[PDB]
């Protein structure tokens, strides 16, 4: 069988998925092009679609048609859903939907359902390049000239998705919601399928109660250390404690090593010398020693440590030396004994993991710890203001 309305072909035995209130999407045809066909009962959801379209991480809108009962929009098809990809890059893929969530919140729409199930993963361009794909505008809502909006409207998302705030206080909610949904969704590209909450049955109880486990990211595993301090936030219960879309982008969780190692030395550089009574240095020494292990001499290799008798300066309970101790190996990298060198490097990658393999917490506790000197031009790659 075969329908046609207007420009848009489709076979109605194909069929991508089912929506809500009937809502039913096909492969199709457009212009000689395959299409995804979203066969709606009606305006607000394609307007919303059609505006944030021009992103590359948005799914592009190609036409409108419309019959007796239906309308019909004509989208970009696309591979697979985010769910069904966790069944065999992940990082690129939750940098790449964040950066469509950061795109749409910057036109004051929320999105207010998100999950695996609406990312999409769109298929190869002519480069072979695939992206993950924001889709699904049904349930959006474009905000008033108000930095929040009512619950008059429902309670909209998908069980287990939904912001606490939303299904409970005095506050409105907010973009916010969003960051909640895609932390969670965050967990379950790393976790490979599970989920913060847990189980599907309770896991909507767990939100409402504040309940959560991370089981998969290990307490000493610097990667993981990284990714429990921003998965921790977003899915705060308290939706104020939650970063915006674009400080997400700026986290240490999407940063390359080169960017790591970068961050240690502008910090360094930036740290010396400061007052060690001063604010920023103490506010980097504070939760030190824990970072440090409490002697950070004993924690290297042999062949570091009796390269770094050199200087009596350097203080095995200090996070500040412990920056310096790597901003010197780095700078003077090239002139090290090869002994130092093959422990240490090659640079920067296999250098800045020597270390932060050695000190889990050491990129994240500097990273929240230097937020003091967010406002400065030097440290904007690294944070948003």
Known sequence: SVVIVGKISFCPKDVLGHGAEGTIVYRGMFDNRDVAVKRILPDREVQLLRESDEHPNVIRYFCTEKDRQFQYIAIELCAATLQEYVEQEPITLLQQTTSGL???????????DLKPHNILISMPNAHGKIKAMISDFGLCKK??????????????????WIAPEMLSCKENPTYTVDIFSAGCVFYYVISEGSHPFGKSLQRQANILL????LDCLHPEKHEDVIARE?????????????????HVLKHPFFWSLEKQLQFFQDVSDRIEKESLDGPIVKQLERGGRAVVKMDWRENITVPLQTDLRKFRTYKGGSVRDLLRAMRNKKHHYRELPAEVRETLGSLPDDFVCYFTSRFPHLLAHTYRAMELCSHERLFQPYYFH
């Open 230 to 246: 921003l998965i921790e936030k977003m899915i705060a219960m308290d939706p104020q404690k939650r970063p915006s879309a674009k």
């Open 143 to 160: 905000l008033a000239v108000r930095h929040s909006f009512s619950r008059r409207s429902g309670v909209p998302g998908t069980e287990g």
């Open 210 to 213: 504040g309940a959560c486990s």
């Open 102 to 112: 950061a795109h749409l919140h910057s036109l004051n729409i929320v999105h207010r």
